[PDB]
Amino acid sequence: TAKIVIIGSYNRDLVWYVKDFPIGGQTINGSFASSHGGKGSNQAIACGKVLRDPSRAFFVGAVGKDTFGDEILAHYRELGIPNCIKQVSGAPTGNAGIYVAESGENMIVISEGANGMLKPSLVPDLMAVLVKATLVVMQCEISPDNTLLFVEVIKQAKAQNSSLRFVFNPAPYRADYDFSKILSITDIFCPNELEALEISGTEGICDDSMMKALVEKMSSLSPSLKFVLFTLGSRGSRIVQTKSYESRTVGIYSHGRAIDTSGAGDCFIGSFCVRLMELAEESTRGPSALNDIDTIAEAARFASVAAGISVTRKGTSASVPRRQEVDDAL
Amino acid sequence: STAKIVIIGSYNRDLVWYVKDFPIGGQTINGSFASSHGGKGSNQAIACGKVLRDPSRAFFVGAVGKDTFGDEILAHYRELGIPNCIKQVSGAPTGNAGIYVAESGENMIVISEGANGMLKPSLVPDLMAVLVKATLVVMQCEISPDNTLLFVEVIKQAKAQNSSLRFVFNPAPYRADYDFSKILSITDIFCPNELEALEISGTGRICDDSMMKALVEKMSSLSPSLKFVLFTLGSRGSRIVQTKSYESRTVGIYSHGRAIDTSGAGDCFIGSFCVRLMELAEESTRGPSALNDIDTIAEAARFASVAAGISVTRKGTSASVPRRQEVDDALSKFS
C-alpha cells in the first residue's frame, strides 16, 4: 500500500553534451544521450530506489501511446514502483531538448505533450490512495489548470486523512502557476534559490531577512503551511518554520569530486520524502512528528547525503544511491 | 538511370523545439517539438531528386545506424525513388541535431554526427565505379574531417579517369577542424556563403568587391582545380567569381511570394544548382567543358534562385523543395 504519492511529469530527455552553448545562429557539434526524465518521474524513481520497499511509492502521470510511452511503463515495471501512468491518444509523450555545457550549466526546453492531459478525471482512483498516504508531492511540469484540479482533490483528501502532508516543489519556476492557491493546502514548500526569488518579487542570493519575509507572506494566506525548505546550492538548505520562524541549517554533503549534478535536485526531493515518511512511522508522536522542525531537519540531512552522493556519479536516475550507502555516509 | 550527381554527406534526424526565445543558461522554458529529416548531405540529395526530371540521376552516399531512424530514411529514399548506397552501421546511432528555433527565426543547432562519422571510402567500396561515370560530386562539412580527406583522394583519382567530373564543395557548416585547403585543391566549384567564406580566410564579420577579390584570391592560391566561387548572399542573391580573371556574374533572388520558412533553402539552392549544372553539361555542343564557362555557371544559378525562391514560400525543410514543373513554370514567367 502506497505511502508516498508523486503526481507529476514524465519527459524523455534528449541531451546534447557540448563544450559551450551555441550562440544564436551557430551550428556546433556535440555528444548525444537519451534518458528518462521529467521532475515528477525523477522524484518517484528516487523514492523507489531510496525506499526500503519500493511498493510504498506511487507515481501519477500521463504519457502518449508511443514508444517513449511504452518504454517508461515497462521501466516502472522493471523498477517495481506502483503507478497509474495513463496512456492518452491526444498528445505524444512529453520530452525535453537539453544542452549541457562542460561547465555543468543547462538549457532545457520541454514539450509538455501528454503531461498537459494529466487531470484527476484521468486517474479516478486517486482519492482512495491519497486518503491512506503520508506524503503527496507535485512540481510544475504539468498544466497550471490541471494542477489546481489536483489541489482540490488533495484538499479533500487531507480533510479525510489528517496524516497526509502535501510537499510542493515549485520547479521549474512557472509564472502561470497560481502559487497562492497551491500554497493554501501546502504543508512543506521546497523552492530553490532562484524559484524563491521569483515567487517573492524582492538579487541572486537569499539572505536571512528575505527568507523570513517570504515565509511570512506565504504563511499569511495559508492555514496549512508549516515549513519552507529553501534549497541554496553551495550553501546547502534552510528550514524555516511558519509563525515562529525557527530555522535549521543543513549543509552540503561532500561525497567526492562532482562529475554530474543532473537530477540532483529531484534526488534530494525524493530522498527527503522517503525519510519524512519513515520518520512518521518510527516515532511515538506519529505523523504529528512531521510538525516538529527537527524531524524536518533530519530528513533534510538524509536528503543532503543522498544528493551529495548523486553528484559524484552520472546518468540522472542511475546516480541515485542505494539506501545502504546513504546509511553508511550518515 | 546512370547516376550523374553523387552526394557524399550526412543524414541527421532533426529534433526541433519551437520556443519564443532561446533559453538562457540555467533556464527551463516550454516549447513545441517536431521531428524531421535533415543532414546537409541528405537534404541536398533530396532536393536533386525532386528538381530532377528523372530522380534516378541523383545518388546519395551516407551512413546511418542500425536503428529506427536509419531504417526510416532508407525507406524514405525508396518512396522518393532516389538511388543511394546508404550503409547501415552498428558503431554509432543515426546522426541527429537538437535544434531551437526562436520566434525571430534564428536557430541553435547541435549536431551529434553519430554514424556520419563512419562514412569512409572503405564503407562504400564501389563508389569509384559510380564516380567515373558521373558529372558532379557534392560534399559538405557534416562528416568527419579525416574521412572527408579520404573521400577527397577518391575524387582526385576519379577526376583523373573522368575529365567530365566536377567537384562541387559547399563548406557548410563552418568547421574549424576541416582542412579546407586540402579539400579546395580538388574542388572545381566552391559555394560558401558570406560568413563561411570569411571564416575560411581568417576573418569573422557586407563585404565589398575588393574584399571578394582577396577572398577568391586566397581560395584559389593553393588549388590547381578551382574554377569558380559561387558566393551565397542570402536575400542579396548570389555572386559567381571566376578564378584568375575575376569575371563576375550577379544572380539576384527570385521572389515567389511571402517568405514563410527559409529552413533548407541553402540546400535546395545547392541541389537545384547541381541539377541544372548537370543538365547544361549534356545540352551543349562543347561537352562538359561548358561547365568551364561563367555564363553556363550563371544559368545554373538563375535556375537555383527560382527553386530557392519557391522553397522560402513554403514550410518544411525538404518538404518545401518544389517539383521541376513548378520550377520550370515560374522560370518562364520570370523571363
Contact B98 A101 (CB under 8 A): no
* Chain B residues in contact with A97 (beta carbon < 8 A): 15, 17, 31, 33, 98-100
Grouping H, G, I as helix, E, B as strand and the rest as coil, residue B64 is strand
CB contact under 8 A, B33 and A105: no
Subunit contact B112:A27, Cβ cutoff 8 A: no
CA distance linking residue A33 with residue B15, whole number of Å? 13
**Has A64 been labeled as part of a binding site?**
no
Query: Please, which residues 221-250 of chain A have a Cβ atom closer than 8 Å to chain B?
Result: none
Residue B176 forms contact with A (CB below 8 Å): no
CA dist., res. B125 & res. B46, Å (int)? 23
Amino acid in the structure at residue A301: R
CB contact burial B233-255 (16+ within 10 A = b; e otherwise):
beeebbbbbbbeeeebbebebbe
Q: Give the whole-angstrom CA distance, residue B296 versus residue B292.
A: 8
> Inter-chain contact B33–A97, Cβ cutoff 8 Å?
yes
B275 sits in which H/E element: helix B265-280
Cα–Cα distance for residue pair B41/A181, rounded to 1 Å: 53
Is A172 in Cβ contact with B25 (below 8 Å)? no
Mark whether B267 is an active-site residue: yes
Q: Which of A28, A101, A109 is closest, CB to CB, to B100?
A: A109
- In angstroms, the first-to-last Cα distance of chain A is 28
Half-sphere exposure of B25 (CA within 13 A, CB side): 11
**In which element (H, E) is residue B145 found?**
helix B145-161
CATH architecture of B1-335: 3-Layer(aba) Sandwich (3.40)
- C-beta of residue A216 within 8 angstroms of C-beta of residue A208: no
Q: Locate the chain B residue with the closest alpha carbon to A15.
A: B98
Give me the torsion for CA of B253, B256, B262, B266, rounded to 10°: -50
Residue corresponding to grid cell 521569483: A198
Residue closest to B274 by CA, chosen among B4, B1, B2: B4
Residue B219 φ/ψ region, left for φ over 0, alpha for ψ in the -120 to 50 degree band, beta for the rest: alpha
Q: Which of B31, B110, B173 sits opposite A16 (nearest CB)?
A: B110
Dihedral (C-alpha) B239, B240, B241, B247: value to the nearest 10 degrees?
-100
CB B14 within 8 A of CB B35: yes
* Angstroms from B298 CA to nearest CA on chain A: 29
Q: Which residues contact B14 (CB under 8 A, 6 or more apart)?
A: B35, B36, B37, B38, B96, B97, B99, B317
- Interface check for B198 against chain A (CB to CB < 8 A): the answer is no
Q: For CA atoms B116, B118, B119, B120, give the dihedral sign.
A: positive
Instruction: Report the distance separating Cα B265 and Cα B268, nearest Å.
Output: 5
Distance CA A189, CA A240 (A): 10
A25/B110 Cβ within 8 A: no
Residues before each break in chain A (C–N > 2.5 Å)? Answer: 202
- Residue B31 C-alpha cell reads as 516549447
Q: Which residues of B touch A107 (CB under 8 A)?
A: 22-27, 100
The phi, psi pair for A121, rounded to 5°, reads -60, -30
User: Which sign, positive or negative, has the C-alpha torsion A281, A284, A288, A291?
Assistant: negative
3-state SS, one letter per residue, for chain A: CCCEEEECCCEEEEEEECCCCCCCCCEEECEEEEEEECHHHHHHHHHHHHCCCHHHEEEECEEECCHHHHHHHHHHHHHCCCECCEEECCCCCCEEEEEECCCCCEEEEEECHHHHHCCHHHCCCHHHHHCCCCEEEECCCCCHHHHHHHHHHHHHHHHHCCCCEEEECCCCCCCCCCHHHHHCCCCEECCEHHHHHHHHCCCCCCCHHHHHHHHHHHHHCCCCCCEEEEECHHHCEEEEECCCCCEEEECCCCCCCCCCCCCHHHHHHHHHHHHHHHHCCCCCCHHHHHHCHHHHHHHHHHHHHHHHHHCCCCCHHHHCCCHHHHHHHC
List all residues 6 or more positions away from A39 whose beta carbon is below 8 Å from its beta carbon.
A8, A9, A139, A140, A141, A169, A171, A172, A266
End-to-end distance of chain B based on CA atoms, in angstroms? 31
Check if the beta carbon of residue B307 is closer than 8 Å to that of residue B321.
yes
CB count within 10 Å of CB B85 equals 16
Distance CA A198, CA A171 (A): 11
State whether residue A18 sits within 8 Å of chain B by CB.
Answer: yes
User: Going by C-beta distance under 8 Å and a sequence separation of 6 or more, which residues neighbour residue A284?
Assistant: none
Q: Determine the Cα–Cα distance for residues A239 and A227; give it in Å rounded to an integer.
A: 7
Asked if the C-beta of A104 comes within 8 angstroms of chain B's C-beta atoms, the answer is: no
Quick one: how far is CA B311 from the chain centroid? 15
- Kindly provide the resolution of this structure in angstroms, with one decimal: 2.7
Superfamily of domain A1-330, CATH level 4: Ribokinase (3.40.1190.20)
Tell me how far the alpha carbon of residue A27 is from its chain's centroid.
34
| Annotated catalytic residue within B267, B293, B295, B329 | B267
B96 touches chain A (CB under 8 A): yes
DSSP type of residue B18:
E
